[PDB]
Design a protein around this ligand. Structure first.
Ligand SMILES: O=C(O)c1ccccc1Nc1cc(Cl)c(OOO)c(Cl)c1
Ligand SMILES: O=C(O)c1ccccc1Nc1cc(Cl)c(OOO)c(Cl)c1
Lengths: 116, 116, 116, 116
């Protein structure tokens, strides 16, 4: 649907399961208002965060709680979390996949944006 | 120089030059206080941000102003900026290089943490 | 199925479509024997390369023809192709997803390996 | 020094030290002739591979022996090695840095190509 987060573990070559993800939307007063949250599945994906109607134009932040993920695996990683910030739907509704590839001292994040 | 930031451009295969970087330290009230800032050099590097005396244990955020970089180059970017958030810890290595590899719709960031 | 290749374009934030992919398997005489080939779909994926029965233990090479991809978009990229080489099925049959994220002067490749 | 290779370790957040690297040039019969080799230094770098006189236009392959690196560290890796294949072109910039960021099940590689 309109916003999906996918997380992979580059150490094990596997989905990153049970990763907490918090989504925020910037308000007109400039604060970050909570928008949605959840955790990744067995497949490393988190679906169902929002609907096209709810997912209006705005600046969004996707915070992925990578530190908690590594700590549960016995690892003390470098980053507190990964934060992905972007304008969405400024030229009409799109579908966003926010992917993150995780390693203890590194991550990458990519967006796949498609027109429904 | 306990903290350096290095930014590369994956489209042009070059250092990312003149990228604004802002560094923040987390205050006790959970807000981000400005701490240091600069623009990357012709080698994509930003040095001289802080000193070992003032770079005490705490949580820091490095914000790299990727959107402006791509706008200057005439390429549509996805992210507002790249954020790197981490804890500084005296027990470990005392030189932190925050590296970022930029593409319009993806970035990676890595910490190279060493002793001298 | 047992081997899938997924390719993304980090410039556009989209699947990399119509990318040629050639798979090779190392023979006992040490040469690279052609094993399968195809091109990525509208979704950037290439499925149907092999079956579990055909996909025996071996060292495989997945060559992704990234240069042809960029050239068709007007770009002169750095790499001739991306080549991904790995042992497969040495502890029994697994499912492999070979992902590649492409930029003109950079790529990343990741494997997601699951036990059916 | 027209060619340098730099390797980083995304698990430990460090230079990848003592990684074997072999460089090849494509011969007119389409085979790979050995050209240079070395191990990365304590800074993850390999210099002195060739000279501008002998580094003529052609297609080169840089093979980074990632599997051995991870084996030494006691972590199961995916890839046999990382291969980087590119054409050297006199018309452009004349210093090539081949950078590789390593995780057990993923790697990225980037070319930083500059003039001095
Ligand atoms: O090559 C990459 O994929 C990469 C990914 C994340 C961060 C940096 C990347 N490249 C890179 C990083 C560092 Cl610290 C670096 O060292 O220079 O001081 C180089 Cl040459 C390249
Ligand atoms: O291919 C990579 O190296 C990579 C780079 C950045 C982010 C994620 C990465 N892998 C990746 C792997 C898979 Cl299987 C994937 O989607 O699968 O449905 C995506 Cl979007 C990305």
């Amino acid at each position: 649907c309109p916003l999906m987060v996918k997380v992979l573990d580059a150490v094990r070559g596997s989905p990153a399961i049970n990763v907490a993800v918090h989504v925020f939307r910037k308000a007109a007063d400039d604060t970050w208002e909570p928008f949605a949250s959840g955790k990744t599945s067995e497949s490393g994906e988190l679906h169902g965060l929002t609907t096209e109607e709810e997912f209006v134009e705005g600046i969004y932040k996707v915070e992925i709680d990578t530190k908690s993920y590594w700590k549960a695996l016995g690892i003390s990683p470098f980053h507190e979390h990964a934060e992905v910030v972007f304008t969405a739907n400024d030229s009409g509704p799109r579908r966003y996949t926010i992917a993150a590839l995780l390693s203890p001292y590194s991550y990458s994040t990519t967006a796949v944006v498609t027109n429904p």
